[PDB]
């Protein structure tokens with residue numbers, strides 16, 4: 001009897017300082033947790049800047065999709081908030097290198113800044129704004145697709161490790177999805193009014209379309 005599907009999953013340890021940062025963030029009380037969304041939208045914008053730049057000299061970079069935009073997708077039934085972009089995306093090595101195993105100077109520097117009295121909202125200036133996701137999320141899943149490459153899924157609940165595997169669910173043309181599985185007391189970020197006010201307040205200068213898709217699984221059809 002054959003399995004419908006089978007795939008290899010790799011588990012990697014976070015570099016020490018990244019593990020420390022994630023513990024501080026996911027565990028500590030902060031009054032301004034809404035900044036996570038700003039940080040994630042900012043990273044999407046950067047990724048969109050990148051594919052756009054590459055396409056300037058090689059238009060075929062956009063064969064996997066010309067539209068450059070950001071989508072925000074609250075799903076109250078799954079208790080997830082997903083941010084999707086059609087940016088450059090990442091290779092498997094990119095995921096492993098850039099989301100856990102190699103620490104930049106900004107990781108330690110940021111924690112030093114916080115100890116010296118800085119605010120968590122500054123996190124983006126240290127290049128680690130992604131991890132601010134764990135202010136509101138207990139688990140984060142990153143689905144990503146780069147040109148000429150397969151679709152991969154990265155995931156961590158911040159236990160000091162993350163997994164990587166091939167994603168065969170729903171094929172993306174190109175880009176990245178960051179799926180936040182929200183903490184039970186952070187479900188306000190699934191509400192339309194909350195998402196809208198946070199984007200209005202913090203992402204006014206993002207130069208790409210940002211579009212809300214309110215997701216609901218229709219009855220008897222989950």
Ligand SMILES: COc1cc(-c2nc(C)nc3[nH]cc(C#N)c23)c(Cl)cc1Cl
Pocket residue numbers: 039040043044047085087088089090098099127128129130131142176178
């Ligand atoms: C600079 O540091 C990071 C960047 C990205 C990232 N990279 C690319 C190519 N696209 C993205 N879209 C949304 C993202 C987010 N968040 C994102 C991630 Cl997932 C983690 C880190 Cl630590």
